[PDB]
Amino acid sequence: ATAAEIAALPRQKVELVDPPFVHAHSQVAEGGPKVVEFTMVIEEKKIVIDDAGTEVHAMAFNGTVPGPLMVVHQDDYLELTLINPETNTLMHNIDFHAATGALGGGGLTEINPGEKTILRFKATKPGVFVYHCAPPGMVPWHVVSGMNGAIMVLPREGLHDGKGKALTYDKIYYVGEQDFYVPRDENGKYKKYEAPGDAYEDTVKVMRTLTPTHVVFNGAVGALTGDKAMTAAVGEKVLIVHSQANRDTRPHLIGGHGDYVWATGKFNTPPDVDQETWFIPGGAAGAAFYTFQQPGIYAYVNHNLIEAFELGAAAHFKVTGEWNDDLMTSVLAPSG
Amino acid sequence: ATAAEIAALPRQKVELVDPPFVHAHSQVAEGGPKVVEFTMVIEEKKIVIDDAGTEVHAMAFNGTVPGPLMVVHQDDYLELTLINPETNTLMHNIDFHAATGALGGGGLTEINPGEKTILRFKATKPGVFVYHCAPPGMVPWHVVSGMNGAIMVLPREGLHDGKGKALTYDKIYYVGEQDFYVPRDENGKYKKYEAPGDAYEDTVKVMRTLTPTHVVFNGAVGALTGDKAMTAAVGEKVLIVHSQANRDTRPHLIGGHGDYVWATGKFNTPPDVDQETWFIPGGAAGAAFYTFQQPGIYAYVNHNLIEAFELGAAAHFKVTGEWNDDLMTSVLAPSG
Amino acid sequence: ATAAEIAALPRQKVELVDPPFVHAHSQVAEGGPKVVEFTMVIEEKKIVIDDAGTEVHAMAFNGTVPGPLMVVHQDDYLELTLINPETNTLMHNIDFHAATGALGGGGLTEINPGEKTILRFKATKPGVFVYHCAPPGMVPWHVVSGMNGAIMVLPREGLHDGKGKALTYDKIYYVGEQDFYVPRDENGKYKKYEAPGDAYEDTVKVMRTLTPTHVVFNGAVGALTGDKAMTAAVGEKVLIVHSQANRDTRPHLIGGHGDYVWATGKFNTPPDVDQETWFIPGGAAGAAFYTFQQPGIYAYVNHNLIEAFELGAAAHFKVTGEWNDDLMTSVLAPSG
Numbered sequence A, B, C: 001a002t003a004a005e006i007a008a009l010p011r012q013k014v015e016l017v018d019p020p021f022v023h024a025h026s027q028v029a030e031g032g033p034k035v036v037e038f039t040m041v042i043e044e045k046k047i048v049i050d051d052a053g054t055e056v057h058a059m060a061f062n063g064t065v066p067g068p069l070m071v072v073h074q075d076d077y078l079e080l081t082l083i084n085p086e087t088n089t090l091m092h093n094i095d096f097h098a099a100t101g102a103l104g105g106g107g108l109t110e111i112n113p114g115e116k117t118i119l120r121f122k123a124t125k126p127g128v129f130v131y132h133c134a135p136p137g138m139v140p141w142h143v144v145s146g147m148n149g150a151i152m153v154l155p156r157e158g159l160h161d162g163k164g165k166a167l168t169y170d171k172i173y174y175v176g177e178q179d180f181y182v183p184r185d186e187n188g189k190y191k192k193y194e195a196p197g198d199a200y201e202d203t204v205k206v207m208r209t210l211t212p213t214h215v216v217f218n219g220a221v222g223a224l225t226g227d228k229a230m231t232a233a234v235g236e237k238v239l240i241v242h243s244q245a246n247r248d249t250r251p252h253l254i255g256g257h258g259d260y261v262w263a264t265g266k267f268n269t270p271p272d273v274d275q276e277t278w279f280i281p282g283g284a285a286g287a288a289f290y291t292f293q294q295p296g297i298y299a300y301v302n303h304n305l306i307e308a309f310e311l312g313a314a315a316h317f318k319v320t321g322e323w324n325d326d327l328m329t330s331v332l333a334p335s336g
């Protein structure tokens, strides 16, 4: 409430980690409200999104696309120190959909290269929320250049299902889905540029068609496959947080389900259950809780299979454990 | 139920107002069921939809894009007098998604220029509902030319949250979102036509691309911005009714939330809460309730930011009142 | 659990029927769990999808687009004998979104032309689910070639509303919606190919536009109209199961509503009510229950009206019975 009361609150410095991993945290809040501090440096950098060497001039929070997931509990204060190095060429800011006021913080955080700012907001509503840059007049360009992420505001008492039973996860992963619009020369080959501003004009043109050239998880085709496939074990309870700051998505765990899905991403809105495919509108984050029952590889995809398999929206899960023949079994293997 | 009963009902004429404003009404029903009378005249006229002077041959109920919001209470009868002036060149009708029978009323209301008709229907289900023109054979064309609106059928006892607690708004706004498909010549310049019919062929080709050239609120880019921005004050409860008769939208109040959102637009379906971004499918209306907590300018947009900032789907809210530093504060303003 | 306990379970072979019809079944379970057997033969065949004679080298389960609806009860075992004829040229498999393990069964059912296989899985979650072919590396191509359908796992106690009140339908229809991507020549005319292979490259290009040339019900424009229109009567309770394995859809019954809609298709997730237009994300099936109140023709459509009336997503209902003037009446017929 009063400035004095907040000043008396305990503070905690949090160390952020690159997605799909999430920084250390407790599901059930340990203590009364606290002022949780985070710091992120913005990095304008070239990223290679496919095996054809296609480049995107990314604008990354903390150096990754998407930016890192920040975890706090309801009614804590999130205090972010955002830094825009002199090495950058553009003005940047940040809008937290979890925050109330000044365009989510964007109106208070406009920093040119060489500046920094510290914003504090009370995480009044529990749920997963998108955050992204939004420089007046250059909003979609920064967002589709990968300048977005999400935060999770856990209820103090952790997650619960619709009937109040607790839902405690064993593992948590953050999948940030991105729609990229890469210009092509007259031959159909993606163009490369020597600077962000150089690509601007060409990129806006592709954007207006509303047809992405690539739709990827964690910044590139295959990011979350192979050496980067997510893992779990049969019997493990996993929470998958998924965000899309500009375009709709329809997550689906091939071989599994969304046991409980907070499709709107808001914990006070009861989760849907036994989901095959859920929907997350552009501009929101959602969360799915599932207990693995079968070992093997799974594919986590945006279920418009063209986007998943032609455009790049596909990730994998490698699960260990014993096969359950009651759930599924090959009565007759493929034969003549 | 019986003949005598329906005939005995009080009749009440209501004067409509142009969106985003809504005609005078009471949230909780005043008295018993009545036959609520409305009259709308159809206007076919050229309108400028952007800052470049792009013209469109609009087809509008009451002359506005979207058509006005009609408000009744559950179990009232809505009796509409629809007039199609002889000066018009096309046949028109109306489909009330709130109505039951004859294609929503479209089958009983086909009027050529020079004709009028009166349709009555019992508003049996509570919620916000889309209404639109639907001449057989050219349904899409009339709808994407601006011929659609919405009605609100309030529960006789007003709005309530998930657990029976009353939700009373101080104001209500109706934002109608329109996807336009304007043809361009070989040079990329939008084309102008003499009569509506002349644009038909070229328009359908653009429509089939499923990519609108414009996505606007209240009929034009910036229609709900600047001096035409909607208003509120800290502590004020606002209901925003939003509709899209042909294409999906994902509404978001930048700097705010949808405290209670009947995303499906139906009041018997519990509203979602603490929403960051909600989803309204094409062919439906939705409603969001919010109590403002911070003063300043807000942007209400379709969260596909390319559609919001490149195509036109962005409106403003100007809110007066005191800033709340507990909710948000700039600890360190942008500095070196 | 053990193969012995499942083998001791009663077995029942079912004869599938072509959509939109559904094979015989009981809403409330007939005794205890059983192994329900189904068989489907895959056929690669050319089909005509519109009145201009446009053809598609379809890949169809049971020779139909969509494949037929399999109906079982929660905790029953679905045992499918899938056959891929010598006459076929491609390998096919099946992924049941209702199943748990091996990519929905897809990794255990890869059969080359001249092969067959038998997969059994426990239908552990109640709801309607999509099933589709998914040959690694050629997933979207098989799906958008028509190789998908849906199954319904009814609660053992039949359907119930969100409050436990029983919901028994008189009729049921299965509407499979298909997005087709047909290449066109320099004259804008759809192309025809000798072998499905010759079409691959051109089709992939169209697929990458994320813009289908046709969006149809039961494999063709107008397939569920005329003498093929669905039927009902005033007072009749009808359940419509709708699926879209690759792309979003927003169903709407013109002139009616979705009284209870399991928009996510999962029966343990309470249905929305009084729906005007609902939403089914690509990769999912949904179900809507409605009691007809008015006689006449109804159009059941995907509510992006361009997809419905330009692309092919519109079906009809012919309803017999008496007109209800209380619900709707033409006070004044179109006149001067």
Ligand SMILES: O=N[O-]
Binding pocket: A252, A253, A254, A255, A301, A305, C095, C104, C134
């Ligand atoms: O289950 N994925 O197509």
Ligand SMILES: O=N[O-]
Binding pocket: A095, A097, A104, A134, B252, B253, B254, B255
């Ligand atoms: O929440 N506005 O991009």
Ligand SMILES: O=N[O-]
Binding pocket: B095, B097, B104, B134, B139, C252, C253, C254, C255, C301
């Ligand atoms: O109500 N469907 O156009």
Ligand SMILES: [Cu+2]
Binding pocket: A059, A091, A092, A093, A133, A134, A135, A142, A147
């Ligand atoms: Cu930025």
Ligand SMILES: [Cu+2]
Binding pocket: A095, A097, A132, A283, B252, B254
């Ligand atoms: Cu935003």
Ligand SMILES: [Cu+2]
Binding pocket: B059, B091, B092, B093, B133, B134, B135, B142, B147
């Ligand atoms: Cu009209």
Ligand SMILES: [Cu+2]
Binding pocket: B095, B097, B132, B283, C252, C254
């Ligand atoms: Cu409609």
Ligand SMILES: [Cu+2]
Binding pocket: C059, C091, C092, C093, C133, C134, C135, C142, C147
């Ligand atoms: Cu196949």
Ligand SMILES: [Cu+2]
Binding pocket: A252, A254, C095, C097, C132, C283
């Ligand atoms: Cu699938």
